Design a protein around this ligand. Structure first.
Ligand SMILES: [O]C(=O)C1=[C][C]=C(C2=NN(C(=O)C3=C(Cl)[C]=[C][C]=C3C(F)(F)F)C3=C2[C]=C(Cl)[C]=[C]3)C(O[C]C2=[C][C]=C3O=[C]OC3=[C]2)=[C]1
Ligand SMILES: [O]C(=O)C1=[C][C]=C(C2=NN(C(=O)C3=C(Cl)[C]=[C][C]=C3C(F)(F)F)C3=C2[C]=C(Cl)[C]=[C]3)C(O[C]C2=[C][C]=C3O=[C]OC3=[C]2)=[C]1
Lengths: 261, 258
């Protein structure tokens, strides 16, 4: 006497996920498998050609590794706003205390950006600019100093996450579960947050059983990935703090990126 | 993939848990909630009571070594329990070691919660109770080393698991295919899938009113991973101050490359 409601919730989230995000996993997989050919960035010279060709919006430090890093930051700021908009479509979310809405987004966005970045990645590289560009793993990993080692962990996660072979309809519910985490620091009213999460968890369970009937305990396996997510976001923050203390932007830019650096 | 067999696995693990671990949650809760004359613990809440306690059943170090001794015994008990998990002893021996190496700390924390309430922890097989305020007020780094165990336990215990639930939960933790340096992930995940199926049915039957308890329990495996990380880091920092500190080889070996 709830199954229909769970399927309704799944479809509602799917529909909103398609509206909120620029490039779906389905579209990104078509591009990556070669099934409208993207510009490939595999080295310095092709980077320089790519910024002319694929019309990047973050280019104004002239050093390459920094300009790539900054472009990741620029795209992360856009994703935060797309996730924020997506969250508003989650049933019950806008009815929560306003401070709790801000807390949930603040502590959730990093985990969601990682998850969704996996949709744009394979073992060889990552889609950029809505699938119009493709930057190689080897190029990113081979950037100097801390920057190479900052990039590679994202791929290491993606490769593992992608082995679950989730589609967009699965991810739309998963992302919602992450946002509605009752254990975030400083939440004023945990009860309604866990009540919503319980519904989303039910919807994700049924979704995964219907969409992947042959993949046993996929639900559990997906929940275990929340462990990898928490871990890598912690590492992330630590790597950023090291970048800050070593690398020597306009105060307004600093202010725009304060959340992500 | 057949309930009868999932229930059979749950009974097997429960029975083995009872054999391997001295002090169950059921017994600990009976001691903590009291109402009984026969099982009443001596309570240690300060230095004098500690002194009387040692007659009846540096201070921060002696307490630390008390915790350490019990952790070593726990590793031994967990190791014995692991062998009873169907399929575990059949795995590559290196993987066996790796699963125990990365699994034992998460299990110690989980099972320590059974011995705790918000005000303290059972010790000496339930014959003692040492207060949280005493432990937290130990000097230097030691106070802050003790307190996070209680902070976890309070949250974990809110789930109200019983021993029959924990037996399966602990098995799930051990059979984690994502541990670093595992040679053969597949047969580990095959066992885990069975344990997960057994856990899900156990929780549905034993807690039918508790919605998505399965999912909430798996989300606690996230807390565990993080708390073990912090534990290891703080223990490493305590080593670089304390020479009067020494770790049993079993623990020392687990911490190398943890
Ligand atoms: O959904 C998308 O389209 C999306 C989402 C995330 C990234 C991306 N973010 N990021 C972070 O570190 C990061 C991450 Cl996970 C999480 C939070 C904050 C940050 C941060 F710190 F930035 F604020 C990365 C990222 C990608 C890589 Cl490969 C490595 C690190 C992204 O990146 C596209 C991209 C690649 C090379 C370029 O080179 C120039 O512009 C580029 C844009 C896309
Ligand atoms: O199953 C049990 O019976 C059990 C299991 C774990 C502990 C315990 N360990 N520990 C550690 O740090 C610790 C932990 Cl989690 C894991 C690995 C290594 C260590 C270590 F670092 F030791 F090597 C603690 C522990 C307890 C607290 Cl409250 C705080 C830290 C335990 O402790 C009972 C105890 C309390 C006060 C006393 O005071 C004298 O003896 C005592 C025994 C029991």
């Amino acid at each position: 006497m709830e199954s229909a409601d769970l399927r309704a919730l799944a479809k509602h989230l799917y529909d909103s996920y398609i509206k909120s995000f620029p490039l779906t996993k389905a579209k990104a997989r078509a591009i990556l498998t070669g099934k409208k050919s993207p510009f490939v960035i595999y080295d310095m010279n092709s980077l320089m050609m790519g910024e002319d060709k694929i019309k990047f919006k973050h280019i104004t430090s002239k050093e390459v590794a920094i300009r790539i890093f900054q472009g990741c930051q620029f795209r992360s700021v856009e994703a935060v706003q797309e996730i924020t908009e997506y969250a508003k479509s989650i049933p019950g979310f806008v009815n929560l205390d306003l401070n709790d809405q801000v807390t949930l987004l603040k502590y959730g966005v990093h985990e969601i950006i990682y998850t969704m970045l996996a949709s744009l990645m394979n073992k060889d590289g990552v889609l950029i600019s809505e699938g119009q560009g493709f930057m190689t793993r080897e190029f990113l990993k081979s950037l100097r100093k801390p920057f190479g080692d900052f990039m590679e962990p994202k791929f290491e996660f993606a490769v593992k996450f992608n082995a679950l072979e989730l589609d967009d309809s699965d991810l739309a519910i998963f992302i919602a579960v992450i946002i509605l985490s009752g254990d975030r620091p400083g939440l004023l009213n945990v009860k309604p947050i866990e009540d919503i999460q319980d519904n989303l968890l039910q919807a994700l369970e049924l979704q995964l059983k219907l969409n992947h009937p042959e993949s046993s305990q996929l639900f559990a396996k997906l929940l275990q990935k929340m462990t990898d997510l928490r871990q890598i976001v912690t590492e992330h923050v630590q790597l950023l703090q090291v970048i800050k203390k070593t690398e020597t932007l306009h105060p307004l830019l600093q202010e725009i990126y304060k959340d992500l650096y």
